[PDB]
């Protein structure tokens, strides 16, 4: 119906809307993580700053997907943003592991989106996904894996000195 | 239970959590409004920029309330962010009127919060609400009323030239 | 025969030559549009400047395709540049609609080229098309759609005040 | 019919349109020459740059003639731009000789145009031709003659060292 | 086994290791070429500088592939770097021809890698190859072809004046 | 045979070629070490940066030896660069110990080279070895010994906090 729509399948539009919702959910999860570490009984300032920065990046990703949906002539349809699975994250290492799991889930969703775009012969959507989302996801997963490895080697759960020093020297 | 908690009633904590959810909902509504005007069949760039700026301000307000909740020793509890009431907003004037209605609703919620804080003899919470939320809400309501009045005088619904010129000269 | 030719099918070379001709034709059409609005009985200076800028961009696109043809070891074969379908364009809105139609035609040609490159297993050609032509085409179509929508809302055909104000405020 | 038309004969308008077409054809020929020397089996970068610069100048000349046609109240009528007479130019010296022949042809056309303008008692058109086209044509012919003479003296056809050194020292 | 591994097939990992070895071999070959021209009985300084620059670029390409292997969770496995096929290269033209042959071989290897990645449905690897290796390879092949053509036209083997002047004017 | 050769014994030329191969092998070993620490399950960025810097320094040493071989009129003869003895280095301390062992081996080779040059009465070669290689080797051995001592005192193998803090404070 749109005057600008060309070679844009409806299934691609629906999948783009789903990815928008997933990105907003990830932003919400990162916000919850960030303000968990601002509590007085946790008090890890650099963890909070890191997760807040991640939350803002996820919001930017969702906005970029919405702009893409408008560019191709599709229609945005927003759903409810579900609350995160946890209220307390119990440690920096546990929050890092949960963030890694969430990023791998988002990467799987993006790979499904790219496969769908390939099946519909939509080169512009494929290139958009490759240029703006796949490499950023790979880099994020690699960085979170590095952080988890360093915290595990330091003795993160049992020794709070480990999380304290990781907060200053790596995330500071 | 918190080592920093002093003169902070549980009802105030619950009301602060509710206000956090309301602020996030307002941010979501403004994001929906902003990307409605980025569509090719609406194409009002300055309306979209205005509503995106409003959305970012609402997110900042929610983050400030979360910081306040952490400062006093309360615990943040997040709920689902409901999707906005509308998908298409049908005009700049209608979106402005809906934004005015939403801001008046938020002002009523903040006034209820202030009354609750007064009843519990919590001067810090009362002053926080007065300093950071009440005057900003009054200014926002006044500005939205001015915009609605100008659009109505210009003939906003029937004449698209009115919305075009308002987009360039007022919001540009 | 070329010492640099590798994995470059002849059908791809022929399609590249055809795309070169199409780009030059689009440049010619935009030049005709630009100097239509420089007439004393039309006198829309910013429309003329916009279409001249589009013409120069199309010439750049054709030159880039010729450079690509030389890079892979193919041979450029030029054809006649057909004169545009119209010499008088009758309004800014009509010229914008014709430009939108032309850009959608060029996008369809580029999509056919990308499909042909995919069928021949030529990743370099596919990436070249994706990187330099597909997103620019999508952006151009979106911008032309926005312009057409704004002109239609203002009342572009019947009211010359609409085209006058669009010339100053949007294209100026 | 034009409100600005004064002392502008129809034959002059037709001849101006013909000159516009000739200028566009010359631009096309120079583009073909320029990308002939970008081939890997020719590989004379400075020859290609020289001919591309000539092509851009010819396009500017055509645009100036179109502006002149609009200034006097005549109507532009575009024809097909014929493809150049050759695909391969076989040497720098041969391309230079062909460019010299083309420029002398364009000079003859401009002299016929000036004679026609003189016969119709149109001083503005005569002065426009004298100021913007005749001296530039004479300078171009002189420069091309100098280049042809130097290439012939160096032994351009048989010795490729001649064309190599001319590319670096004269056109570089 | 890696915590960051996702959608990364083992055959892709093995092919990445093979490409790493090929890149290191190319760097070694270019180093041999570079120091062949530093000999007192050859004494072409700019040829040596050119080939040393190529060697450093190949080392950078190998390091980038190793970084890619670490990013996706694969394991690097290094093999022996074979000595180059020749120790004396006998002329600048012969070295240029051998470099062209080597670059075409590397391009064929990269195309096989891209085909393998496509067959395994690995969009990130495909985009990495397209973004960082395919266009650089095409440009390198085009430049080497240009150099070979110019040297052949000047009379590179029989006339040492040709190689001397090419060393100063093109590679200097 | 070389016109520049003077007081340059064949055994010295062969030993110089062997030292070139040894330097290239050391560069390869350091590259392997550097990218071992870039893995997600090791994740010691500063160790990786240190070993990459060492690898580049070894490549520079090999290039300097090749330049020396060309200066005196000898002929470079390259051999295969053997793959390093290990794939995984298992700790920062173990990699440091292996680097120390490798540097002591290289120092022994250089001392044998200097003794050979002394026996052949070649003062220029002796002074070249003394000026550019012996003191650098002594400094490298001293620095690696310091690093090994500090890691051992910190408790490097059993305690990963030791390697983490050494990575930030010494190598950072």
From Swiss-Prot, chains A, B, C, D, E, F:
Gene it is expressed from: FTH1
One GO cellular component, as annotated: ferritin complex
Function: Stores iron in a soluble, non-toxic, readily available form. Important for iron homeostasis. Has ferroxidase activity. Iron is taken up in the ferrous form and deposited as ferric hydroxides after oxidation. Also plays a role in delivery of iron to cells. Mediates iron uptake in capsule cells of the developing kidney. Delivery to lysosomes is mediated by the cargo receptor NCOA4 for autophagic degradation and release of iron.
Family, per entry: Belongs to the ferritin family.
Binding site for Fe cation 2: 58, 103, 137
Tissues of expression: Expressed in the liver.
Consequence when changing residue 103 to A: No effect on iron binding but the oxidation rate is severely reduced
InterPro entries, A to Z: Ferritin, Ferritin-like, Ferritin-like_diiron, Ferritin-like_SF, Ferritin_CS, Ferritin_DPS_dom
A Pfam family the protein falls into: Ferritin
The UniProt record lists the keyword Acetylation: yes
List of residues binding Fe cation 1: 23, 58, 61
Compartments (UniProt record): Cytoplasm; Lysosome; Cytoplasmic vesicle, Autophagosome
Site-annotated residues for Essential for association with cargo receptor NCOA4: 18
Record-annotated Ferritin-like diiron domain positions: 6-155
Disease: Hemochromatosis 5: A disorder of iron metabolism characterized by iron overload. Excess iron is deposited in a variety of organs leading to their failure, and resulting in serious illnesses including cirrhosis, hepatomas, diabetes, cardiomyopathy, arthritis, and hypogonadotropic hypogonadism. Severe effects of the disease usually do not appear until after decades of progressive iron loading. Neurodegeneration with brain iron accumulation 9: An autosomal dominant neurodegenerative disorder associated with iron accumulation, primarily in the basal ganglia. It is characterized by global developmental delay apparent from infancy, and progressive decline of motor and cognitive skills. Clinical features include delayed walking or inability to walk, spasticity with hyperreflexia, ataxia, dystonia, and poor or absent language.
Keyword set, alphabetical order: Acetylation, Cytoplasm, Cytoplasmic vesicle, Iron, Iron storage, Lysosome, Metal-binding, Neurodegeneration, Oxidoreductase, Phosphoprotein
GO function term, MF aspect, one: iron ion binding
EC number: 1.16.3.1
Organism: Homo sapiens
Protein name in the entry: Ferritin heavy chain
Gene Ontology biological-process entries: immune response; intracellular iron ion homeostasis; iron ion transport; negative regulation of cell population proliferation; negative regulation of ferroptosis; negative regulation of fibroblast proliferation
Catalytic reactions of this protein: 4 Fe(2+) + O2 + 4 H(+) = 4 Fe(3+) + 2 H2O
Oligomer and partners: Oligomer of 24 subunits. There are two types of subunits: L (light) chain and H (heavy) chain. The major chain can be light or heavy, depending on the species and tissue type. In the human liver, the heavy chain is predominant. The functional molecule forms a roughly spherical shell with a diameter of 12 nm and contains a central cavity into which the insoluble mineral iron core is deposited. Interacts with NCOA4; NCOA4 promotes targeting of the iron-binding ferritin complex to autolysosomes following starvation or iron depletion.
Substitution effect: residue 23 to A: Reduces iron binding and oxidation rate
């Amino acid at each position: 119906t749109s005057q600008v729509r060309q070679n844009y399948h409806q299934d691609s539009e629906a999948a783009i809307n789903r990815q928008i919702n997933l990105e907003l959910y990830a932003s919400y999860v990162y916000l919850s993580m960030s303000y968990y570490f601002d509590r007085d009984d946790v008090a890890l300032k650099n963890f909070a700053k890191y997760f807040l920065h991640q939350s803002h990046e996820e919001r930017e990703h969702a906005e970029k997907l919405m702009k893409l949906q408008n560019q191709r002539g599709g229609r945005i349809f927003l759903q409810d943003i579900k609350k995160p699975d946890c209220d307390d994250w119990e440690s920096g290492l546990n929050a890092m592991e949960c963030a890694l799991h969430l990023e791998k889930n988002v990467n799987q969703s993006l790979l499904e989106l790219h496969k769908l775009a390939t099946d519909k012969n939509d080169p512009h959507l494929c290139d958009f996904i490759e240029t703006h989302y796949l490499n950023e996801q790979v880099k994020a997963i690699k960085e979170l894996g590095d952080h988890v490895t360093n915290l595990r080697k330091m003795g993160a759960p049992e020794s709070g000195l480990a999380e304290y020093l990781f907060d200053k020297h790596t995330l500071g």
